[PDB]
């Protein structure tokens, strides 16, 4: 029953799991788990882009075995970089973020937990979660990578929040 790359597929460094929630634990529901770039695109092709939703919603993309909640053992001592977005940016930013995460672009070893895009009333929020909030070398490198892969204006505000706060 283990999810594994298919023949001739491009394997990922980790299995990942898509989740979603909609404001209407089991608030957050699994969509599916994938092991290769091809499986990722197949899953992705079925999902509405976050910019095409206007109701209170979230997508979560986390390493398999990590629940998208801070109480998870992998998240308990961690934190996240948060970027608030005016409407119209979330779809492209989400895609850029998860491609970077899946492709191991952050170069922080095992530290990445997952990514979230949140659709709110007059803004959207994108974030990337890591395991150790007190690891400044790691959080700084994640910040630098975000700057490079999101391609947002240079004065874009990013904020780091430790989960326990």
């Amino acid at each position: 029953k283990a999810v594994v790359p298919g023949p001739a597929e491009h394997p990922l460094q980790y299995n990942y799991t898509f989740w979603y929630s909609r404001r209407t634990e089991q608030n957050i529901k699994q969509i599916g788990t994938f092991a290769s770039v091809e499986q990722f695109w197949r899953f992705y092709s079925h999902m509405v882009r976050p910019g095409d939703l206007t109701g209170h919603s979230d997508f979560h993309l986390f390493k398999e075995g990590i629940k998208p909640m801070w109480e998870d053992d992998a998240n308990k001592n961690g934190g996240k970089w948060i970027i608030r977005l005016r409407k119209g940016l979330a779809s492209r930013c989400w895609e850029n973020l998860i491609l970077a995460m899946l492709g191991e672009q952050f170069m922080v070893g095992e530290e990445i937990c997952g990514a979230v895009v949140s659709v709110r009333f007059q803004e959207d929020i994108i974030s990337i979660w890591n395991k150790t909030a007190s690891d400044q070398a790691t959080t700084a490198r994640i910040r630098d990578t975000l700057r490079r892969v999101l391609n947002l204006p240079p004065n874009t505000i990013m904020e780091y929040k430790t989960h326990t706060d």
Binding site: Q13, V37, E38, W41, R42, L99, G103, Q105, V149
Partner: peptide, 26 residues
Amino acid sequence: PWPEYIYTRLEMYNILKAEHDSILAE
């Protein structure tokens, strides 16, 4: 050591292109 499986953004999209075209049998 580096991870085994590193993909640039362009490499991710190159794979998408391949996947898109596979409606024809090889």
